[PDB]
């Protein structure tokens with residue numbers, strides 16, 4: 001159990017990306033998402049994720065509906081947030097990362113953190129984090 | 136002359152929006168843009184822009200190329216930033232706003248601030264700012 005990452009909305013914006021129909025991740029994470037990182041984790045991003053994220057890092061995957069209206073992509077309603085929280089001693093079986101998810105009402109969502117980490121093991125080279133900070 | 140808003144990338148993310156071909160603003164601002172606001176201006180956004188932004192507010196319109204690859208919208212190279220800086224006494228003829236623009240190399244771009252403000256007068260009711268903070 002991790003408390004809702006209150007205030008993540010004001011953290012540093014790392015990158016954005018829209019997953020469109022047909023994308024292999026559309027069914028789970030389809031829509032427009034923004035990634036945010038708290039102060040503790042930001043420097044590791046800025047240096048290119050060549051060292052592990054420190055304990056206390058929190059990263060939030062903010063997933064929104066993608067609305068297409070009048071030659072524009074608009075932010076629709078929030079779908080969910082995904083959260084990764086670094087604590088090597090607390091999460092030894094998922095690479096030191098605590099995987100969590102919350103709905104738009106801020107209530108926890110039932111997830112399988114082992115399944116989150118299974119895919120994120122593809123990014124083991126950069127401490128299990130896919131996104132790169134976009135200047 | 137306004138100095139480049141160094142560090143805006145770490146300010147609060149207000150909203151995002153993609154302008155697609157055919158949009159009336161595509162030729163000038165086509166692509167994926169993110170809006171950021173410095174601490175001074177953030178509270179006015181959070182309260183719904185019912186009062187004027189305070190002196191010292193800086194808002195940045197960060198415009199990126201929109202890349203469509205493999206059922207995804209990806210952030211492409213930066214195109215430009217637009218900047219609005221609140222100083223009622225400094226900019227009396229543009230509603231207290233200083234309009235500025237910078238290229239990807241951080242160098243000023245030659246703009247007509249009166250033309251920026253002419254369109255933003257459409258948002259005079261919310262102190263000449265169109266965007267709303269998206270929770």
Ligand code: HEC
Nearest residue numbers: 017059060061082083084099100111115116119129130131
């Ligand atoms: C592959 C099948 C994945 C599964 C299962 C999970 N995630 Fe993931 N995640 C995936 C990708 C390709 C990305 C990068 C997105 C981008 O814009 O580049 C992410 C990102 C995240 C993040 C941001 C940090 C990062 O790794 O870049 C978080 C905080 C995150 N995802 C959380 C998360 C959770 C909680 C999951 C289980 C419910 C989960 N992910 C599964 C791919 C995949």
Ligand code: HEC
Nearest residue numbers: 152194195196217218219234235246250251254264265266
């Ligand atoms: C109409 C023809 C416009 C002209 C001319 C200029 N801008 Fe503008 N701007 C316009 C819209 C519709 C928006 C909202 C975008 C959104 O995502 O909702 C904006 C936004 C900005 C912002 C962000 C603050 C805000 O008003 O929401 C900035 C800092 C900004 N624009 C700068 C700017 C500059 C420097 C311009 C002249 C070079 C300029 N704008 C012209 C519409 C129009």
